[PDB]
């Protein structure tokens, strides 16, 4: 389901009391099907920096309200998030921004989720590839290929190794979207695209809980539709995980405290109101322009995995 | 009802094919009702214009599409409110405070739809009114009041005002009087010039009783007449009766006529009330039939 696959989470914003306790609710209820997920007062919200670090944004408010702060970002069809408005009782769930991209989805998801009533009235390649995990080489023809995109024309993606659920253009053409390295095509219009291996952080008491992370490091894997040879690394405060990196195959990294009291990212989970482990391990991890994929999910109360670009 | 007494009217504005079709079975709803409604396309449609000429707009389109309008001129707003192309919702974009909620209830009903839902100025209260405000250095407070929602006291008045308005430490005065630590914004009630458009064979019956009509819709007794115009010369009959000036109106006059406000394509009441209205004369009522023969439309009597 497209409310799975927003690996950066959704961040929701209310603006008074009522909203607040709605949002908290909201909120509770996404963590239940492992939404990665944050509840801003909007007093604390930097909508301009929440804006590039979420995948979704649920306001909580008047739609009149939503709008306002909606008009002040919209700027960008293929990069914005998805945006949706829901009221304070929870009676709707409407979709703003991003009807073109998956917002009437989330909105009819997530009041699945909510039990309650979504009022409904295509991609790019940049979204394309942030759901592959994967950089674009050659962006001058990204123009090309989102038009063709909107006509929902038939574009193929050449070089996939899982099974992915894309529309139904999408063929896995005079458009070829392309992770193999060693063809070529006459006569089409082409995107490479560089598939990028991942970094992922554990953050873990002192009794590391071996199993429980080895399950949530295939969980992960699943999650996000990628092969173990997609690892780059591992990382975390807890020098036994290594022995994990070592099943997997992959480098490990010992991430000490001077490294994480050091560090800073805008897009990082916030400390509950009511630490910040395995985000921070798999960015420093992952190098310099890191950039996180995977918003610190739970594997319980001793665990968490946080997945960033391994770079 | 809130939508009666929409007076300028509403527009609806639509983008796609669909949505027009939309538009029209929308506009004939509200045409059995006596409400002023003009359909434009996106294309042909300067919302600039629109904006300021019209009590509000429904935008039958994508949620979506309204509010990336709405958001280019959001600047004495109308009320907005957005229709899906099937009609299945009506949910109100702006104005939530001066009406917008009322209007997508009362709109929802008439329509049979489902709305969604999710105070006043002194300016509003003065074209609620039909008067004029002499004293606008005292606007800025009294709103800041209304905003507050302090209650406002109306003196020289019945008219369906929320529970703050009593007919106070604020007042708005229609008498002349003076007011001890108050404060008081004055108004100076207008009289209204009536503009009939008809047929060359007057029905004069039809033409008397839309006079009534529209005095009540305004809630005006005769009194408040100050003129009644028409290119037909046996409208003065009428005029008469009422022992009020007629004005009749030549084709000329109405070929120099502009005004952008206008209902668009002829169109003679409208132009006819704002001729005889005078000088800078507005337009209150948006032309509204009383048959295919007869329209009527009134404008502010800006005259002697």
């Known amino acids: 389901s497209l409310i799975e696959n927003l690996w950066r989470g959704i961040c929701i914003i209310s603006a008074s ?131 063709a995109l909107l006509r929902d024309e038939s574009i193929c993606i050449d070089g996939i190794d899982v099974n992915v659920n894309f529309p139904e253009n999408i063929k896995v053409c005079s458009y070829i979207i392309s992770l193999r390295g060693d063809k070529e095509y006459k006569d089409k219009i082409v995107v490479w695209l560089k598939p990028l291996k991942i970094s992922i952080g554990i953050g873990s008491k002192k009794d590391v809980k071996m199993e429980e992370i080895r399950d949530g490091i295939y969980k992960v894997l699943e999650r996000l539709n990628l092969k173990r040879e997609r690892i780059g690394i591992i990382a975390s405060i807890r020098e036994e995980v290594k022995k994990i990196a070592d099943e997997f195959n992959v480098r490990f990294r010992l991430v000490n405290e001077e490294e994480i009291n050091n560090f800073m990212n805008p897009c990082l989970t916030p400390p509950s109101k009511t630490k910040g482990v395995a985000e921070i391990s798999a960015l420093i991890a992952g190098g310099r322009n890191s950039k996180l994929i995977l918003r610190k999910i739970a594997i319980s109360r001793n665990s968490t995995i946080a997945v960033a670009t391994y770079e």
């Open 17 to 147: 009391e009522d909203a607040f306790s709605a949002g908290e609710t909201i909120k509770e209820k996404l963590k239940s099907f492992e939404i990665p997920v944050v509840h801003y007062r909007y007093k604390d919200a930097e909508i301009e920096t929440i804006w590039k670090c979420y995948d979704a944004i649920v306001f909580v408010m008047a739609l009149e309200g939503a709008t306002r702060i909606v008009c002040k970002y919209a700027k960008s069809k293929t990069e914005d998030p998805a945006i949706v408005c829901i009221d304070d009782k929870i009676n709707y769930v409407i979709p703003l921004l991003g009807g073109h991209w998956g917002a009437n989805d989330i909105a009819r998801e997530l009041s699945v989720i909510l039990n309650s009533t979504p009022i409904i009235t295509k991609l790019s390649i940049e979204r394309i590839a942030n759901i592959l995990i994967a950089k674009i080489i050659n962006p001058e023809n990204i123009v090309k290929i989102n038009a």
